[PDB]
Each structure stands twice: as structure tokens, then as C-alpha cells.
Swiss-Prot record, chain B:
Compartments (UniProt record): Endoplasmic reticulum membrane; Cytoplasmic vesicle, Secretory vesicle membrane; Cytoplasm, Perinuclear region
Gene that this sequence comes from: Itpr1
PTM comment, free text: Polyubiquitinated. Polyubiquitination targets ITPR1 for proteasomal degradation. Approximately 40% of the ITPR1-associated ubiquitin is monoubiquitin, and polyubiquitins are both 'Lys-48'- and 'Lys-63'-linked.
Organism whose genome encodes this protein: Rattus norvegicus
Disulfide bonds: 5-11
Domain notes: The ITPR1 structure has a large solenoid CY assembly built around the central helical bundle made of the C-terminal domains from four ITPR1 subunits. The solenoid scaffold includes domains responsible for binding of ligands and regulatory proteins and is connected via an allosteric nexus at the cytosolic-membrane interface to the transmembrane channel assembly. Six transmembrane helices from each subunit form the central ion-conduction pore.
Annotated TM spans: 47-67
Subunit: Homotetramer. Homodimer. Interacts with ERP44 in a pH-, redox state- and calcium-dependent manner which results in the inhibition the calcium channel activity. The strength of this interaction inversely correlates with calcium concentration. Part of cGMP kinase signaling complex at least composed of ACTA2/alpha-actin, CNN1/calponin H1, PLN/phospholamban, PRKG1 and ITPR1. Interacts with IRAG1. Interacts with CABP1 (via N-terminus). Interacts with TESPA1.
Function statement: Inositol 1,4,5-trisphosphate-gated calcium channel that, upon inositol 1,4,5-trisphosphate binding, mediates calcium release from the endoplasmic reticulum (ER). Undergoes conformational changes upon ligand binding, suggesting structural flexibility that allows the channel to switch from a closed state, capable of interacting with its ligands such as 1,4,5-trisphosphate and calcium, to an open state, capable of transferring calcium ions across the ER membrane. Cytoplasmic calcium released from the ER triggers apoptosis by the activation of CAMK2 complex.
The name this protein goes by in its record: Inositol 1,4,5-trisphosphate-gated calcium channel ITPR1
Entry's family note: Belongs to the InsP3 receptor family.
């Protein structure tokens, strides 16, 4: 009401009285509610001291992952997420006392990134030369020591660069390559495996630290799928350290499945999986009918050429199951079944029968069915892109709480961007709860 | 004499990238199982899994990404 | 002009990148390049 009073607590950023004014402005929220008589009134309250103990990553997760129900409102799931956020803030305040556990839980990204990187490098080491018979052999430059000296020069040039601006993995890779030639490769791989397993057993503690599920017991931490996945990763890492080496390749999926875009394209493939499975079943039954037709009428045309392992050049398939195997062999090769069956030679009476048989198989099975599978995949891309742009637009041009659109705030003595940060800020609603 | 073998697990990756082409899959370059060796069904499911999953799903994934980018741009 | 001749072929790209529709289709390819690179890496690990 007092315009003179209003214009001297707000612009207090440029005055010397900063402590009291910006402290009390920072620690004061504002919320609007509706009472029984459907009247809207405004409440000004102090924020709790525990509400500042909330990580902004969880805030972004709550802002993005909340979805609207059939009535078009996000508050119903927001309440449950608010309760979970309250428990998370309680555990964060409890955790902040410990100096070393908070240091481990504060740096999860470093442990995860270095584990991913050195497991990738471990897979690259086991992939290039498996039998571990030497390092001197190579189709590279005239000496392997030349490439080793080049790597040493690269490491020396990277050791005088800027402090961790770029090339941090380059010097480590050069050092690992230089250690590979000085000492035997199996000691180097044992050292790298021990480093990865100690990295994983400290990262598991770092993960269970800030995600404080383990303070309530054992059932909740055991039943968690993410903890089980991390434990499985640790188990197969220890198994690949102790018996043979291919389990690093096994955990390469868990490595490369950490980002979102590769996830999105794959998991679009796994979205409408039931049309894909049913189309595969349709292909199987079409192959079955074509195989029994070939068993009935073209039994002697199924001569195909094979080569025999040393202790005549042709085999026949007459069991109606080997014929299904041959038709699934001919489901590949693009042309169809006519590329594996013997050539009709234009003079046998079953020539036109062979021509229409081959053309029907090729056209109907190959074209229609394989194009059906690919059309299902493409349509799933279209559906995902449409719903993603729809939810992004409704998040960007609509208030989270009020649900009103940007078009209602044309002039109205206010703006939308101050409405959605002062009048209807949802973190003020969480603070009030 | 007219034939070579690849036993290094890197030459095998080279041969599998050689067989990532040719459309049919890896079953067109490997020798024919001749129906009587015990590892016949293992070869059949191996070839079918490689062809179906790798060829169909992955190459159709790349082309689907390209087509979806056309749709977004338009 | 001074050494060998194939650098005319090298500058043929700069020649054909002067219109707009070709640029539109090329960077329809290279707009979402990171899904394509990650799908290629997925193919590489499946081959492995
Ligand atoms: C060869 C024998 C088998 C080798 C196994 C393949 C190894 C797969 C590694 C995939 C890889 O390189 O990942 C990077 C993907 O690579 C690339 O981005 C581009 C490299 C080019 C890929 C080549 C594909 C060509 C294959 C052709 C068939 C992304 O890593 P980066 O972003 O650093 O770190 C992010 C991780 N964080 C989030 C923990 C920090
Ligand atoms: C396309 C690639 C074009 C490659 C051009 C080849 C250069 C031709 C000059 C003569 C070949 C040469 O260099 O001889 C050396 C042989 O060099 C090689 O090893 C391979 C030659 C080519 C090297 C690969 C370069 C690939 C670069 C690809 C360019 C990237 C383009 C991507 C953007 C479009 C010496 O032999 P050596 O050191 O005793 O090793 C032989 C291997 N042994 C031991 C098993 C018999
Ligand atoms: C032989 C194959 C054995 C089959 C069993 C392996 C399947 C793995 C079971 C657990 C799947 C899992 O990890 O669930 C997570 C799904 O994660 C994955 O997508 C990884 C899938 C594991 C690889 C499956 C390959 C099977 C072949 C969901 O949690 P998450 O998404 O991590 O939430 C945090 C998100 N972060 C990582 C970005 C912060
Ligand atoms: C999991 C399925 C694989 C388990 C079946 C047994 C595999 C097996 O034979 O173990 C081998 C090794 O064990 C493994 O590597 C099995 C793990 C493989 C699983 C990871 C990849 C799975 C991809 C498919 C899903 C030991 O054989 P190897 O020692 O070589 O003998 C020859 C060595 N010589 C020449 C030096 C004498
Ligand atoms: C032939 C090949 C055989 C392998 C196929 C087995 C892979 C199954 C992947 C999987 O877990 O799918 C789940 C996918 O689980 C989900 O929660 C959906 C998205 C999140 C999970 C990401 C899946 C990652 C795929 C695995 C990558 C491995 C590549 C294959 C290499 C062998 C369950 O399907 P879901 O989608 O719930 O069905 C409901 C559909 N809705 C959403 C439309 C209601
Ligand atoms: C190769 C790619 C095919 C696998 C896609 C992943 C998968 O199997 O998901 C299916 C999930 O599993 C199944 O539904 C059928 C399982 C059949 C076998 C699964 C693995 C495929 C191997 C084929 C042999 C389908 O998801 P679905 O949940 O139906 O969709 C939503 C339907 N709702 C709304 C009614 C729930
Ligand atoms: C179901 C469709 C039914 C097709 C009926 C075919 C009508 C023709 C009947 C006789 C076929 C014929 O004439 O055979 C000749 C050749 O055979 C054929 O004609 C093959 C018939 C192929 C049919 C044409 C293609 C139609 C498209 C099929 C569509 C299938 C897929 C559907 C996609 C929508 C060889 O005889 P000819 O040459 O006189 O004498 C040779 C002796 N000489 C050397 C002394 C001269
Ligand atoms: C993973 C799938 C597991 C498949 C299990 C196979 C079940 C059959 C077990 C025995 C196989 C069998 O019968 O072998 C016969 C033939 O081998 C096969 O059957 C090959 C099995 C092929 C499996 C059918 C295809 C299923 C589709 C696979 C889907 C893969 C991709 C997934 C897409 C969704 C040869 O034996 P037979 O003929 O009695 O005796 C010959 C001796 N004679 C000459 C005296 C008569
Ligand atoms: C860029 C890399 C190319 C550098 C490698 C050397 C190129 C080279 O050989 O120079 C030739 C000419 O120079 C070039 O080739 C430079 C052109 C390279 C760039 C064009 C293609 C790039 C595409 C890949 C990106 C001259 O050789 P030439 O005269 O023939 O000798 C045989 C002729 N005889 C039989 C009459 C004796
Ligand atoms: C395997 C093949 C290896 C060759 C691949 C190398 C080509 C890289 C293409 C390139 O230069 O990309 C730039 C392309 O830059 C532009 O997009 C601006 C337009 C101008 C650039 C014209 C590129 C023309 C390339 C000609 C074809 C190359 C032929 C291959 C060599 C033989 C930058 O990518 P950009 O898409 O900005 O990323 C931002 C993505 N956003 C928009 C979603 C944020
Ligand atoms: C062959 C075609 C694939 C090349 C496409 C061009 C390209 O590389 O663009 C990438 C740009 O480069 C990269 O991101 C990774 C580089 C990997 C290697 C580049 C050349 C590919 C050769 C593979 C070996 C991806 O574009 P990007 O701008 O990220 O997308 C927007 C994501 N933002 C919003 C986070 C920026
Ligand atoms: Zn509002």
C-alpha cells in the first residue's frame, strides 16, 4: 500500500545495509491458498532452516520428472515427491556433520567417470591382443618403441599443459601404455583390475552415503534395483578380475548405458515390443506355410551345397523341420528363397510353379514383413518425439501450480516470469509443507 | 593355399566387421555346417541372432534417427 | 595449379556447398549426430 516503503526494501542491493535486508529477503517465502468459501488469500511465512539443505540436482529431478494426471494437474504427484524430499533433507542434515563421508558422497561423479573410463580402456586392452604372447609384434610403424617414445613425448607435453583443462585421460593412457611395455601385460592387467575393484568398492559406499536408505535397515537397501545393479557390476568385475577376462566385455553394456540419447533410441526400440514380437510370430508362421508347401511340391529342389570338416558336396533336407531351417536360412540373403533352391532350367514342367513360388515368397514375406517391423520402429520414434515436444512445451508455457497459460498475462500489471517465481513458486509450497 | 584362418580375437573382430556388410549377416562368410556336426543348431541360432538383432535393429535404428531428424526439421 | 591435379576435386565440396537444400539434407544428417555416433558405438560393442 505504501509506495514509498515498497521502493526502499526492494532496491537494497546497491546500499550498504545488505546483511539484514537480503538475509530477511532470502529467508522469506510467499504462498497462495484457497479456503472453504473458495476465496484466495496470500500467506507470508519464514522458511524452515532445514529447507536450505536440499541439493539442486534433486530439485531439477522433481521439476522435470513430475507428470500430470487425467485432469491436467501436477500437484498430486508433487505431494508424494515432497514427502520424499522431506526425508531426503532430514538425511542430508544428518549427513552434513561427518567430514569424510560427506566428502565421499559429494564426489560421486569423479568416481563414476574414472571407473567408466578405465573399464573402457581395460576392454580396449583385452580386445586388441588376447593370448598375451608379446607386445613386439604389430602391423604399426617400424618399431613399437617408436610409438612408445611418441606416447612418452605426448605425456611430457601434457604434463606441462593447463591444470586439468583437457587431456587428463591422455596422460593416464600414455602412462598405462608405457607401463605395458616395461613390465609384463598380465601384471599390468592385474593392477588395473585391482584399481577398478577398489574404485568400485569406494563408489558403492559413496552411493549408499548420500542416498541414505541404509539408515532404516537392510530390506529397503537390498530391494533397491539401483543398488542391486551396482552390486552385480561389482560382482562381475571381481569375477573378471579373478577368473579369465571376458566379464569386462560383459560389463561394457553397463558402461555405455549411462547416457540419455543412446538410451532413448534403444528404449524406443523396447517400447512397442509386443507389435515387434507379434510381427516376428507372423513371419514365423508364413515361413512355416511356405516350408510345408515346399515339402509338398518342391521336395527335390532343396539341394544345397555344404563343405565338410575333414576326418559329396551336396545335402538334401527331407524332414519338414530341416525344411523350416532352410527357409529360415533363406529368410536372409535379400533375394528370398529362390537364391538357395536349385535353378529350374526352363524345361522341367514345374517352372512356372517355381517362378510364382519364388516371387510370392520374396514379395510378400520379405517386403511386407520386414518393412512392417521397420515401420513399427519408425512410428515409435514419431510417437516419442511428439510426446516429448508436447510435454516440453506444456512445461515451458504454463505455470506448474496454477496451470494457467502464458496468454492470460498479457499486460495485467504483472509478468508471467515473476508470477512463476514469486506468486506461485513451487519451492515455496514445498517449504510451507 | 586359397584359405586363411583368423585366431587372435582381433582378426575375429575384423572378420565380424567384414560380415557386418553383405546383408545376410555373419552366416555368409563362415563355413557351412553340413547338418551332421554336433554344433549345427548352435550355428543356426548364432547366425539368426546376429542377423536379426544386429542387422535389423541397429541399421534400422540409424535410419530411424535420420528420418526423425527430417521430421523435426520440417 | 602448381603441384599435381586432384586439389580441384578437393575443392569440389566447397563448390557444391553453395546452395541451401543440399545443406538442409546434409545437416539433417549432422543435426542429431550424437545419437548416430552412440548407435555406431553400440553396434561396435555388439560386434565385439
Ligand atoms: C574395438 C574392440 C572393442 C572395443 C569396445 C568398444 C568400447 C566402447 C567405448 C564407447 C566410448 O568411447 O564412449 C564415449 C563415446 O564416444 C564418443 O563420444 C565419440 C568417439 C567415436 C566413436 C567411434 C564409433 C565408430 C564405430 C564404427 C562401427 C563416451 O565417453 P565420454 O563422453 O568421454 O564420457 C562420458 C561418461 N561420463 C558421463 C561418466 C562422464
Ligand atoms: C584410405 C587409407 C589410404 C592408406 C594409404 C597407404 C599409404 C601408402 C604408402 C605405402 C604403404 C606403407 O606405408 O607401408 C608401411 C605399412 O603401413 C601400414 O601398416 C598400413 C598403411 C596405411 C596406414 C593406415 C592409414 C589409414 C588412414 C585413414 C585416413 C582417415 C580418413 C577419415 C576421414 C575421411 C610400412 O610397412 P610396415 O611398417 O612394415 O607394416 C606392414 C604390416 N605387416 C608388418 C603386417 C606386413
Ligand atoms: C545376461 C544378461 C543378464 C540380465 C540381467 C541384467 C539386467 C540388469 C538389471 C537391473 C537394470 C537396471 O540397472 O535398472 C536401471 C536401468 O539402467 C539401465 O538402463 C542399465 C541397464 C543394464 C544393462 C542391461 C543389459 C542386458 C543384456 C534403472 O535405474 P537407473 O536408470 O540406473 O536410475 C538412475 C539413472 N542414472 C543412471 C542416469 C542416474
Ligand atoms: C556365460 C557363458 C559362458 C560360460 C560357458 C563356459 C565358457 C568357457 O569355456 O570358459 C572359458 C573362459 O571363460 C569365459 O571367458 C566365459 C565368460 C564369457 C562370458 C562373457 C561374454 C558373453 C557374451 C554372450 C552373452 C575357458 O576356455 P579357455 O580358457 O579359453 O580354453 C582355451 C585357452 N587356451 C587356448 C589357452 C588353452
Ligand atoms: C532378440 C533379442 C532379445 C533381447 C531382447 C530383451 C531386451 C528387453 C529390454 C527391456 O528391459 O524392456 C523393458 C523396457 O523397460 C521400460 O521401463 C521402458 C523404458 C526404460 C528401460 C530401457 C531398456 C534398455 C534396453 C536394453 C539394451 C540392451 C541391448 C540389447 C543387447 C543384447 C520392458 O518393456 P516395457 O517398456 O516396460 O513395456 C511397457 C511399454 N510401455 C512403456 C509403452 C508401457
Ligand atoms: C528384439 C526386440 C523385441 C523386445 C522388446 C522388449 C519387450 O519384450 O517388451 C515387451 C514386454 O514383454 C512382453 O510383453 C512379452 C514378452 C515376450 C518375450 C520378451 C523378450 C523377447 C524375446 C522373444 C523370444 C513388450 O512390452 P509391453 O509390456 O507388452 O507393452 C505395453 C503393453 N501394456 C500396456 C499392456 C503393458
Ligand atoms: C497366381 C498367378 C498365376 C500365374 C499364371 C501364369 C499364366 C501363364 C501360364 C503358362 C506359363 C508359361 O507360359 O510358361 C512359360 C514361362 O513361364 C512363365 O510364364 C512363368 C509365369 C510368371 C507369371 C508372370 C508374373 C506375374 C506377377 C506375379 C505376382 C506375384 C506376387 C504378387 C504381387 C502383387 C514357358 O513356356 P513357353 O515359353 O511358352 O514354351 C517354352 C518352349 N520353347 C522353348 C519351345 C519355346
Ligand atoms: C535360444 C533358442 C534355443 C533353440 C532351441 C532348439 C530346440 C531344438 C533342440 C534340438 C535341435 C534339433 O532338432 O536339430 C535338428 C535341426 O537343428 C535345428 O532344429 C535348429 C534349431 C533352430 C530353432 C528354430 C528357430 C527359432 C527362432 C529363433 C529366434 C532367434 C532370433 C529371435 C527373433 C525374435 C537336427 O536334428 P534331427 O533333424 O532331428 O536329426 C538329424 C539326423 N537324421 C538325418 C537321421 C534325421
Ligand atoms: C592428402 C593426402 C595425399 C598425400 C599422399 C601423396 C600423394 C601423391 O602421391 O602425389 C601425387 C599427386 O598428388 C596428389 O595425389 C595429391 C591429391 C590428394 C588429395 C585428393 C584426394 C583426397 C580424398 C580424401 C580426403 C603424385 O604421384 P603420381 O604423379 O601419381 O606418381 C605416379 C605417376 N606416374 C605413373 C606417371 C609415375
Ligand atoms: C564416418 C564419416 C566421417 C565424416 C564426418 C565429419 C562431418 C562433420 C559434420 C560437421 O561439420 O558438423 C558441423 C555442422 O555445422 C552446422 O550444422 C552448421 C551448418 C554449416 C556446416 C556445413 C557442413 C557440410 C558438410 C559437407 C559433407 C561432408 C562430407 C564428408 C567428407 C568426405 C557441426 O555440427 P552441428 O550440427 O552444428 O552441431 C550442433 C547440433 N545442434 C544444432 C543440434 C545444436
Ligand atoms: C557420420 C555422421 C556422424 C557425424 C555427425 C556430425 C557430428 O559429429 O556432430 C556431433 C558433434 O560432435 C560431438 O558431439 C562428438 C564428436 C565425435 C566425433 C565427431 C566426428 C564423428 C566421427 C566418428 C569417429 C554431434 O552434434 P552435437 O552438437 O553434440 O548435438 C547437440 C548436443 N548438444 C546440445 C549438447 C551440443
Ligand atoms: Zn500460477
Amino acid at each position: 500500500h505504501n509506495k514509498e516503503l515498497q521502493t526502499m526494501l526492494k532496491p537494497g542491493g546497491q546500499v550498504d545495509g545488505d546483511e539484514a535486508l537480503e538475509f530477511y529477503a532470502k529467508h522469506t517465502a510467499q504462498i497462495e491458498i484457497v479456503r472453504l468459501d473458495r476465496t484466495m488469500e496470500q500467506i507470508v511465512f519464514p522458511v524452515p532452516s532445514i529447507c536450505e539443505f536440499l541439493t539442486k540436482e534433486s530439485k531439477l529431478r522433481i521439476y522435470y520428472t513430475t507428470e500430470r494426471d487425467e485432469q491436467g494437474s501436477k500437484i498430486n504427484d508433487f505431494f508424494l515427491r515432497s514427502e520424499d524430499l522431506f526425508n531426503e533433507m532430514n538425511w542430508q542434515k544428518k549427513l552434513r556433520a561427518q567430514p569424510v563421508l560427506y566428502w565421499c558422497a559429494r564426489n560421486m561423479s569423479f568416481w563414476s567417470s574414472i571407473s567408466f573410463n578405465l573399464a573402457v580402456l581395460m576392454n580396449l586392452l583385452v580386445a586388441f591382443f588376447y593370448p598375451f604372447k608379446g607386445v613386439r609384434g604389430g602391423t604399426l610403424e617400424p618399431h613399437w618403441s617408436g610409438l612408445l617414445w611418441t606416447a612418452m613425448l605426448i605425456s611430457l607435453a601434457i604434463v606441462i599443459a593447463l591444470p586439468k583443462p583437457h587431456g587428463i585421460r591422455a596422460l593416464i593412457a600414455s602412462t598405462i601404455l608405457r607401463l605395458i611395455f616395461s613390465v609384463g601385460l598380465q601384471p599390468t592387467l592385474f593392477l588395473l583390475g585391482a584399481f577398478n575393484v577398489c574404485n568400485k568398492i569406494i563408489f558403492l559406499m559413496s552411493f549408499v552415503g548420500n542416498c541414505g536408505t541404509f539408515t532404516r535397515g537392510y530390506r529397503a537397501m537390498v530391494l533397491d534395483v539401483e543398488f542391486l545393479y551396482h552390486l552385480l557390476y561389482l560382482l562381475i568385475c571381481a569375477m573378471g578380475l579373478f577368473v579369465h577376462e571376458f566379464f569386462y566385455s560383459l560389463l561394457l553394456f553397463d558402461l555405455v548405458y549411462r547416457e540419455e540419447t543412446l538410451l532413448n533410441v534403444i528404449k524406443s526400440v523396447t517400447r512397442n515390443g509386443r507389435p515387434i514380437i507379434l510381427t516376428a510370430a507372423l513371419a514365423l508362421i508364413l515361413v512355416y506355410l511356405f516350408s510345408i508347401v515346399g515339402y509338398l511340391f518342391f521336395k527335390d529342389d532343396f539341394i544345397l551345397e555344404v563343405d565338410r570338416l575333414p576326418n559329396k558336396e551336396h545335402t538334401c533336407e527331407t524332414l519338414l523341420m530341416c525344411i523350416v531351417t532352410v527357409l529360415s536360412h533363406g529368410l536372409r540373403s535379400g533375394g528370398g528363397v529362390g537364391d538357395v533352391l536349385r535353378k529350374p532350367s526352363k524345361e522341367e514342367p514345374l517352372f512356372a510353379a517355381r517362378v510364382i513360388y519364388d516371387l510370392l515368397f520374396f514379395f510378400m514375406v520379405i517386403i511386407i514383413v520386414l518393412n512392417l517391423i521397420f515401420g513399427v520402429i519408425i512410428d515409435t520414434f514419431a510417437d516419442l518425439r511428439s510426446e516429448k515436444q508436447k510435454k516440453e512445451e506444456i512445461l515451458k508455457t504454463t505455470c506448474f501450480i496454477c496451470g494457467l497459460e502464458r496468454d492470460k498475462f498479457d499486460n495485467k500489471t504483472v509478468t508471467f516470469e515473476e508470477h512463476i517465481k514469486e506468486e506461485h513458486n513451487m519451492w515455496h509450497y514445498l517449504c510451507f509443507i
